[PDB]
Design a protein around this ligand. Structure first.
Ligand code: HEM
Ligand code: HEM
Ligand SMILES: O=C1N[C@@H](Cc2c[nH]c3ccccc23)C(=O)N[C@H]1Cc1c[nH]c2ccccc12
Ligand SMILES: O=C1N[C@@H](Cc2c[nH]c3ccccc23)C(=O)N[C@H]1Cc1c[nH]c2ccccc12
Ligand code: HPA
Ligand code: HPA
Lengths: 388, 388
């Protein structure tokens, strides 16, 4: 009997199966939700090895007829977003946009966004849902600023993410409708009469005065979607940790300069990644004790690696004072997250404002009664109800 | 081994267990989520008997120390809402508020609300989530109008419902904080300096010039919460039915006057009641083959009764042309829903607008991949993504 993948939408503890997989068969043949077979890689050493070995290809996971962990929901070129951004002279604009340093006002602006959202929740009084009342609008605001578009339509745009990042056994009429829906939105913002001036779109506008609208809007849409969903989901998991372990919040209030280390450890700990990092083998590769064949699917289990005791002592305990923390929460090798610094900044600023404004933050009900979203690329609570 | 209750969260087909219980043990001892035991009553004849026999008591289900299907989340007096309303001389004001005929404008206004919400979704284009974009704002609008309060804070109020109607094994801190939070909101509206003149709070403000502020606000909050959550959840189920069975939408387009019968049948079919109707036996009672003892919990499984083939031929098939339809979707006996006519009007007007405005309505992905909300009094999809 082949073990099933994915593992468990419960995101507040490591799935027992992840620990058993890493200890017993750190390169394991599993059945994905499509019915296809894959190798699931669950130890830190083998995970890191896959990500740093370019005979394991991310681009080719989107090719027709290769085994899949779930149905493609975007055009196969978009999975190669970073390849297309490089070959079209788009890297500079993208890289500059993904720099917390190129937006000298960004930090103070995110801080004000965080505080405005929390002041509203404080006005109404507890309980409140920190997903709809905080992480969702906060992440949407950030990526609206990244693109240079207003935040007016953030509810609609985050609703597009609710469809775009669905994990489905088979493709489903709508992923494409949903894609072209928000592609059209991005094309319109880019071709507006007072041509857009700030953000990614502004750089795009100048760029084509010296690449198609479709490609430009594709890069804007996929950056918005991937970034808003990944930051919002990570922040929710970080909040759950702070609510469940109030001594961590006491540490952050007493020693604000530790926010960088803290978020780095929360990143190691966090289970927001609800699928694995996929690669197609371009060649036969011996990995651990398994001979992987050219053309087979490889799945890197980030939470397997980030909780591996060979690398992280007491991996199951959050620890803001680890000597070393070489976690894989942002991936590694060629496709290491190009927005890691922004992801860190986004979460550091939100949690700093959170522990200051809601010092008695706690969950409104037992953590085991949170509703964890099914069938989605991210693990997240549908609602995050808290008291303070 | 005792069968577990509740049955299943998936709301688009009758749980197979409901048909098995009804056929083999229509009065069945079950283990509720609290660990308490109860008698689950799942055939039509015995369901209706329980509802019409007043030695099965609703008010006493809230008593300290009685067996429970889930933790009390409101003050125990509120389970006796209608009792308190009748004894405090509030019945006339309440029933006048719940009468669609007493609000001669209500029909045209509900139609216009439904159209504005659908036009907004047409503006943006498919896909859309008809829960957040349609059934939630529409139901909150109606119940804001019922109370005489603005709709400004409807997301906050609907979010209070997300906590109030949770089913928990044990009491949780959020329930009481949540309750008094929105009790105070209602008190604030009732005691505004421009004293309220419209709706239930207008009728209340007059009444106390001729019962405390707390009781008045309690009735307002319980009616908002119960009515909004119940109409929103039913309407979501009816939409699924029209999306899954477009011949039904074709029928409503071709013959709009059948909307009343259609909604009557959708009510029989609908699985929005996600728990059972609770009663405590006040005396020993022989129900079917089972001797029920004084003090024991009795649970009326509405969908068991409404799908009973002894009463409803081909119960699994929606049918707008049934000779008879004496369904229990509003309950029966002394606690029959006092707002049945309003619930029907609410759904009729929304669904008439829906099949006119979205003639090609269909689900955006397969029905089996809808996310059904866990741990809630209602069965409902977390998102209702559709195309048109
Ligand atoms: C806490 C936040 C985030 C986490 C946990 C995270 C994590 C990751 C991971 C694990 C990868 C590697 C995937 C692989 O190798 O297959 C990745 C790649 C990527 N991420 Fe994120 N991410 C975050 C935020 C963001 C933000 C804010 C953006 C954009 C605005 C972004 C854009 C990208 C892009 C474009 C790639 C693809 C890189 C490539 O293919 O070379 N991420 N991220
Ligand atoms: C489609 C919508 C609705 C459905 C399916 C529904 C269903 C029901 C059912 C089955 C009961 C009986 C519960 C029991 O016997 O324990 C009930 C009672 C009740 N409902 Fe409804 N309901 C709906 C709408 C509404 C609305 C719109 C309001 C208020 C504005 C409302 C207020 C009440 C009240 C106050 C009771 C308690 C009556 C008593 O205890 O005697 N309902 N409802
Ligand atoms: O830029 C990308 N690079 C890869 C890897 C990747 C980066 N960030 C992710 C976040 C989740 C899953 C995969 C990725 C990819 O696969 N796609 C896009 C992002 C994206 C935009 N909309 C989407 C809908 C569905 C899936 C991915 C995307
Ligand atoms: O008026 C009531 N009468 C009974 C029966 C009842 C009517 N409508 C329901 C809808 C769901 C469950 C029970 C009922 C009751 O129990 N309470 C309230 C309604 C209510 C307001 N807030 C709540 C939070 C939690 C549970 C109930 C309520
Ligand atoms: O959750 C994720 N899964 C896979 N690849 C990713 N790249 C960024 N986030 C993710
Ligand atoms: O869903 C419900 N459950 C129990 N009692 C109810 N009264 C109205 N709706 C409900």
């Amino acid at each position: 009997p082949l073990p099933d993948f994915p593992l468990s939408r419960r995101g507040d503890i490591l799935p027992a199966e992840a620990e058993r997989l890493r200890a017993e068969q750190p390169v394991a043949r599993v059945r994905t939700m499509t019915g296809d077979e894959a190798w699931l890689v669950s130890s830190y050493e083998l995970a890191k090895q896959v990500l740093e070995d370019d005979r394991f290809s991310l681009k080719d996971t989107a090719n027709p007829g290769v085994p899949r962990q779930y149905a493609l929901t975007i055009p196969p070129e978009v999975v190669n977003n970073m390849g297309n951004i490089n070959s079209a002279g788009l890297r500079n604009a993208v890289m500059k946009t993904l720099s917390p340093q190129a937006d000298r006002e960004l930090g103070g602006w995110l801080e004000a966004q965080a505080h405005q959202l929390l002041d509203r929740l404080i006005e109404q009084g507890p309980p409140a849902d920190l997903r709809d009342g905080f992480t969702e609008p906060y992440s949407a605001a950030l990526h609206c600023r990244l693109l240079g578009i207003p935040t007016d339509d953030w509810r609609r745009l985050m609703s597009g993410i609710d469809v775009a990042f669905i994990t489905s056994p088979r493709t489903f009429e709508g992923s494409a409708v949903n894609w072209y829906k928000d592609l059209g939105y991005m094309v319109d913002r880019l071709n507006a009469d007072p041509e857009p001036t700030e953000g990614l779109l502004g750089r795009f506008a100048e760029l084509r005065r010296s690449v198609s609208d479709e490609l430009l809007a594709t890069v804007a849409l996929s950056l918005f979607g991937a970034g808003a969903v990944s930051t919002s989901a990570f922040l929710q998991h970080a909040i759950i940790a702070l609510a469940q372990q109030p001594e961590l919040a006491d540490r952050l209030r007493a020693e604000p300069a530790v926010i960088g280390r803290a978020v780095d450890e929360l990143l190691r700990y966090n289970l927001s990644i609800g699928d694995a990092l996929p690669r197609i083998a371009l060649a036969d590769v011996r990995l651990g004790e398994v001979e992987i064949r050219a053309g087979e699917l490889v799945l890197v289990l980030i939470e397997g690696a980030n909780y591996d005791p060979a690398v992280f002592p007491h991996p199951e305990r959050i620890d803001f004072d680890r000597e070393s923390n070489p976690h894989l929460a942002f991936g590694g090798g060629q496709h290491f997250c190009p927005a890691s610094a922004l992801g860190r900044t986004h979460a550091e600023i939100a949690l700093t404002a959170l522990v200051e404004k809601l010092p008695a933050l706690r969950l409104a009900l037992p953590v085991e009664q949170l509703a964890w979203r099914p069938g989605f690329i991210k693990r997240l609570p549908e609602r995050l109800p808290v008291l303070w």
